[PDB]
Design a protein around this ligand. Structure first.
Ligand code: NA
Ligand code: NA
Ligand code: NA
Length: 248
């Protein structure tokens, strides 16, 4: 019952029933003129001050949440790429908030990077607040995907021609490398945005995942998480499970 665990539990419980959007930021493998662009082909560290700051935050989140009782053999390239993506994902969120003149304190968000059995690296984002309504989901997904595709093409470490860069930009947009949770529906039919309950989804699902500590990563594991209150960021796997237990 450290103050950090109690604080995280209380912060989530107060937001147990807050409706929020659920997004996934992802990438997919691309080959352009024989050039292979994989999940970790986005390793430029762009020298924009905000991005640099966000990347430092990811690094320090990793460092503080690391359990040294146990060895961690995650590849250095994998960590670097995840830190970069954390910065890029957040840059996208913050760009859209600016478009809507949303003061950051009026938003609650949670980010968790995971490795899926089939899709590999992806990043879950929950985000919402008083300035949000369900009907805005589609617009949010589209805007986020604009920024995500733009940043990915800027961060790509593969030497690309201009035609290749443009093609990559259009693939990331057309193939929806940012997804939005909707209710299940028929392909033809309307797709309704499905809000999730912030605190509950975090405590009863995201905090239940196993921490990735190897390369290759364990399927279904998490790399790194953070939230707008800096509440869960530094928690080790064991502490995360204590939060779920106390939350219940
Ligand atoms: Na970068
Ligand atoms: Na790896
Ligand atoms: Na994070």
């Amino acid at each position: 019952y450290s103050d950090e665990v109690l604080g995280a539990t209380n912060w989530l419980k107060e937001k147990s029933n807050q409706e929020v959007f659920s997004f996934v930021f992802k990438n997919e493998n691309v080959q352009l003129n024989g050039k292979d662009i994989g999940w970790n082909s986005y390793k430029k560290e762009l020298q924009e001050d905000e991005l640099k700051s966000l990347q430092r935050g990811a690094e320090t989140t990793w460092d503080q949440s690391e359990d040294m009782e146990w060895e961690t053999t995650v590849d250095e390239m994998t960590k670097k790429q995840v830190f970069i993506f954390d910065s890029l994902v957040k840059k996208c969120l913050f760009e859209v908030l600016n478009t809507k003149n949303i003061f950051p304190g009026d938003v609650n968000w949670f980010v968790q990077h995971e490795w899926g059995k089939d899709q590999g690296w992806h990043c879950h984002v929950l985000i919402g607040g008083k300035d949000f309504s369900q009907a805005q989901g589609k617009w949010w997904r589209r805007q986020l995907n604009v920024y995500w595709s733009r940043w990915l093409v800027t961060a790509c470490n593969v030497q690309l021609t201009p035609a290749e860069r443009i093609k990559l930009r259009e693939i990331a947009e057309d193939n929806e490398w940012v997804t939005l949770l909707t209710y299940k529906h028929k392909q033809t039919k309307k797709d309704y945005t499905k809000c999730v309950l912030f605190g509950n989804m975090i405590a009863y699902y995201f905090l239940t995942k196993k921490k990735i500590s190897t390369s290759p990563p364990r399927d279904g594991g998490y790399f790194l998480s953070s939230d707008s209150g800096w509440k869960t960021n530094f928690l080790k796997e064991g502490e995360r499970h204590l939060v779920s237990k106390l939350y219940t």
